[PDB]
DNA sequence: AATGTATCTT
DNA sequence: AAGATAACATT
């Protein structure tokens, strides 16, 4: 039963996975369950497909693609988002800094819960959906690729924000003639250390948020109100 | 000043 | 698979 695939029903329908692939996903989830007896995996099993519960597949406006979940216990299942009682991590600080600098009426919030963006059509996905406490480069690759390939062919006029070189590698999956693809180095401060001589654009000054909104406005779609967050 | 978060090259 | 890099906001 599709209950074991942990995906929200709208997604289980949209993606329309084959029997073969449903068994490949079920085997991976059972492998992660086994791993949890030994080591600690983030996020918890229940919160793996959290991004699928917030965001409806047909409603997607922007696709933000990260590297992998946070590894200090703050991963929520929705990429780069933290719990409202939880302290905003460095990566999320950099995102809020670029929003402050670019978006006109934006003001950085006290809380880091991006649930509001998902309800607005922002898919916060990572290339790998799990992490060992304190890397799972494991076998998620195929599924996150399947999601991107599925969004790119089924939906029209979406924006794909790729951050870091693990995200950038997904570039050939997106149909450039149908959607907008914007690439930048990862928001993490460590991305300013490695890749100081990088040919890829720096996250600081990338202006992805306004650029995405201009594309949506141009294609007569509703914009993302980035500033619509707690406080 | 010390600390805690990728990218590239081998 | 793993080590050098010497960024930078926050503490």
Author numbering: 24 to 157, 161 to 163, 165 to 258
Article sentences:
Efficient γ-herpesvirus lytic phase replication requires a virally encoded UNG-type uracil-DNA glycosylase as a structural element of the viral replisome. Uniquely, γ-herpesvirus UNGs carry a seven or eight residue insertion of variable sequence in the otherwise highly conserved minor-groove DNA binding loop. The UNG leucine loop is a conserved structural feature which is responsible for widening the DNA minor groove and flipping pyrimidines out of the base stack and, in the case of uracil, into the UNG active site for catalysis. kUNG, in common with other known UNGs, comprises a single C-terminal globular domain made up of a four-stranded parallel β-sheet flanked by six α-helices, with an additional left-handed coil of three helices at the N-terminus.
The crystal structures reveal that upon DNA binding, the loop extension favours the disc-like configuration previously observed in the EBV UNG–Ugi complex. In the kUNG–dsDNA structure, the kUNG leucine loop extension (residues G222-R229) is ordered via a hydrogen bonding network centred on the side-chain of Q212. In the kUNG–dsDNA structure reported here, the orphan base of nucleotide dA27 is actively flipped out of the DNA duplex by the extended segment (common to all γ-herpesvirus UNGs) of the leucine loop, a feature not seen in any of the previously published structures of UNG–dsDNA complexes from human, Deinococcus radiodurans, Thermus thermophilus and Vaccinia virus. The extrahelical conformation of nucleotide dA27 is conserved in all four monomers of the crystal asymmetric unit where the base is solvent exposed and forms no contacts with neighboring molecules. Hydrogen bonds between the NH2 of the adenine base in dA27 and the phosphate of the neighboring nucleotide, dT26 rigidifies the orphan base in the crystal providing clear electron density. Indeed, this fact is exploited in UNG activity assays which rely on the fluorescence increase upon liberation from the base stack of 2-aminopurine bases in the orphan position. In the kUNG–dsDNA structure however, both the adenine base and the deoxyribose moiety of dA27 are significantly displaced from the duplex stack with a distorted backbone conformation being stabilised by hydrogen bonding between the guanidinium head group of R223 in kUNG and the phosphate moiety of dA27. The position in the base stack usually occupied by dA27 is taken up by L220 of kUNG in a manner strikingly similar to that of the strictly conserved ‘doorstop’ leucine L217 which displaces the substrate uracil base from the DNA helix flipping it into the UNG active site. In contrast, nine residues of kUNG (S215-R223), including the entirety of a five-residue helix (P216-L220), intercalate between the DNA bases presenting two leucine sidechains to flip out both the substrate deoxyuridine and its partner nucleotide in a duplex nucleotide-flipping mechanism.
